[PDB]
Every structure is written in C-alpha cells, then in structure tokens.
C-alpha cells in the first residue's frame, strides 16, 4: 500500500512564516544554552565564508485568517510557535575555534497552547 | 504589555517525534533538489569532523492519542508532517568541495491535510 494522499496529495499549510538568510549572525544560543559568538562567517584557512543563517519571522496565518481552523481559540490558544533547529557554527568561544550547535528559528507552526495564566 | 502566556506559559505540544544525531549522512537532497554526497564528515585540512545530522522519525501523537485535538480526522486529515531544514554540508560535488544547503528533517508537526484523493 502506498499512501500518496495524506503525504503528498492534500494540503500542508495552516500558519505561514518567512525565513530570511542572514550572514550577520554574530551571536547565537548554543545547545548548552550559552549565547556564543557565531561571528557570521567561518574562517577556513585564508577564506572566510558567511554562513546563511535562518531568521524566521512568524506571520499571522493567512490560509485560516483568524486563528487555526480546528483549534478553539477560546478554550485553547491558537499560537504559531517558532520551531528552532540546531545548526553548526564555527565559534571562537574557548581554545581557538569549534563547530558547535546553535539554535536558529527555521519555521512557525500553529499549536493549541493551554489557557492557564492571563 | 508582555505576553508571557501564549508564549512561555501554556503548552506547546501536540505531536511527538524523535530526532537522532547521525554522522553517517553520506548523501542528502540539497537546496536545488539534487541528492549530493554529504559523506558525513567534513575535511578541514588534516582533521575530519563527522557532523551531527538530524534524522527525525515522526511518532504517533501521544498527548492527544488518536489524532490531533481540534482537527477533525473525518473531514480533514490529521497528519504529522516532517519539517525539514537546510543545513550546511561540505560536499565534494563539483570542482573540489563546497558548503551547500542540504535538507534534513528536524521535527514533525500535526497539520490538517485536505481530503481529496483516496
């Protein structure tokens, strides 16, 4: 059996967002949780390469307009949370230089957050 | 005004998934759509570094069990789609070596896919 629908056929959108490629990511939060100096460009011998980092701005879900079709924005909180991933950056934080994991936001997805605090 | 709820206070989970760190990503689909030879390890002069890539397996949403609370699995298709990001890999596909964007799945999020094809 090959499920082409609910995989490729259908729809995979609810909340939209925009990711811009920045080479000026001078600092970023690493895996450990430390905001390390990423600089923006990696120095390979005598050649520097500005790495395209993703700055993702969440946008107000246009395919559903109000909130998120399905999620009750009264009982729950239809919110587009920013999904961030761990990319590799040549940072000079300690010793000389190391390729560490830094957290960059790469998408915004709608999730039903729970009402508890006003 | 500082919205701590619907941002930090609340809940941000609906579909769970697991990302494993692999250093044996020998090939991956680049930004252009070509499955390039990533090898798995980057060669920096005389030092090779196996880059931790993310292989994310989608899991059956346990916080909601059946499908996705809010999404009607009869009218719509509650499906956890795998969100993939563009990481940088030193590939030897052309000339000598270049740091290209390759697509790796980093998360799985539930979206109401549309019924159309069976």
UniProtKB/Swiss-Prot annotation, chains A, B:
Sequence positions that bind a 1-acyl-sn-glycero-3-phospho-L-serine: 88
Disulfide linkage: 15-80, 58-108, 68-110
Impact when changing residue 100 to W: In HSAN5; impaired processing of the precursor to mature NGF; nearly abolishes secretion; loss of function in stimulating cell differentiation; loss of the ability to activate the NTRK1 receptor
Subcellular location: Secreted; Endosome lumen
Protein residues bound to a 1-acyl-sn-glycero-3-phospho-(1D-myo-inositol): 52, 88
Highest taxon in the source lineage: Eukaryota
Disease: Neuropathy, hereditary sensory and autonomic, 5: A form of hereditary sensory and autonomic neuropathy, a genetically and clinically heterogeneous group of disorders characterized by degeneration of dorsal root and autonomic ganglion cells, and by sensory and/or autonomic abnormalities. HSAN5 patients manifest loss of pain perception and impaired temperature sensitivity, ulcers, and in some cases self-mutilation. The autonomic involvement is variable.
Function, in words: Nerve growth factor is important for the development and maintenance of the sympathetic and sensory nervous systems. Extracellular ligand for the NTRK1 and NGFR receptors, activates cellular signaling cascades to regulate neuronal proliferation, differentiation and survival. The immature NGF precursor (proNGF) functions as a ligand for the heterodimeric receptor formed by SORCS2 and NGFR, and activates cellular signaling cascades that lead to inactivation of RAC1 and/or RAC2, reorganization of the actin cytoskeleton and neuronal growth cone collapse.
Subunit structure, as described in the record: Homodimer. The homodimer interacts with a single NTRK1 chain. The homodimer interacts with a single NGFR chain. The NGF dimer interacts with a single SORCS2 chain (via extracellular domain). The NGF precursor (proNGF) binds to a receptor complex formed by SORT1 and NGFR, which leads to NGF endocytosis. Both mature NGF and the immature NGF precursor (proNGF) interact with SORCS2 and with the heterodimer formed by SORCS2 and NGFR (via extracellular domains). The NGF precursor (proNGF) has much higher affinity for SORCS2 than mature NGF.
Annotated family: Belongs to the NGF-beta family.
Name of the molecule in the record: Beta-nerve growth factor
Organism: Homo sapiens
Encoding gene (name): NGF
Residues of the full protein shown: 122 to 239 of 241
């Amino acid at each position: 059996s090959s499920s082409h629908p609910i995989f490729h056929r259908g729809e995979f959108s609810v909340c939209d967002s925009v990711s811009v490629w920045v080479g000026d990511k001078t600092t970023a939060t690493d895996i450990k949780g430390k905001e390390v100096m990423v600089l923006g460009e990696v120095n390979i011998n005598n050649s520097v390469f500005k790495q395209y980092f993703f700055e993702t701005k969440c946008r107000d879900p246009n395919p559903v307009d109000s909130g998120c079709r399905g999620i009750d924005s009264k009982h729950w909180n239809s919110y587009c949370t920013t999904t961030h991933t761990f990319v590799k950056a040549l940072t000079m934080d300690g010793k000389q230089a190391a390729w560490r994991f830094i957290r960059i936001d790469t998408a915004c997805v709608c999730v039903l957050s729970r009402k508890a605090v006003r």
